[PDB]
């Protein structure tokens, strides 16, 4: 059977869709820097072909290289980190209008962050510098390579 969507490995390719994404000026888990986020996001492991709604995944069971994801609580809410190698690339769905991240001209690598209440609701966040794709709602597609476990 195919590797489950909850099992990630370094070097995996992650394709994400953020339907009706909204702009947040300050993402608590991203150093209070801006982010686009969606509550109807889907996540795809491109090489394995497996996929699921982000809100369908139990994020405290997701692993990267067999290790639980790093998690942080900010203002009482829990966020889970899927680190990348390189940056997160995103654009307006169906267009060539690209977004860019907060650290758009640094050598910093990005991370996907997921808020999960422990039930069947979850928000996917991607770093953005500003409202270059609008304040929302805007359909956004994202693409990254899963990175190593954070020290």
From TrEMBL:
Subcellular locations according to the entry: Host Golgi apparatus; Host cytoplasm; Host endoplasmic reticulum; Virion
Source organism, top-level taxon: Viruses
Ranges of residues in domain Structural protein 2 C-terminal: 1-74, 77-137
Coiled-coil positions: none
Subunit structure: Self-assembles to form the capsid. The capsid is dominated by dimers that define the 30 morphological units. Interacts with phosphorylated protein ORF3. Interacts with host TMEM134. Interacts with host ASGR1 and ASGR2; these interactions facilitate infection of host hepatocytes.
UniProt record similarity statement: Belongs to the hepevirus capsid protein family.
Annotated protein name in UniProt: Pro-secreted protein ORF2
Naturally occurring in which organism (per UniProt): Hepatitis E virus (HEV)
Organism taxonomic ancestry: Viruses, Riboviria, Orthornavirae, Kitrinoviricota, Alsuviricetes
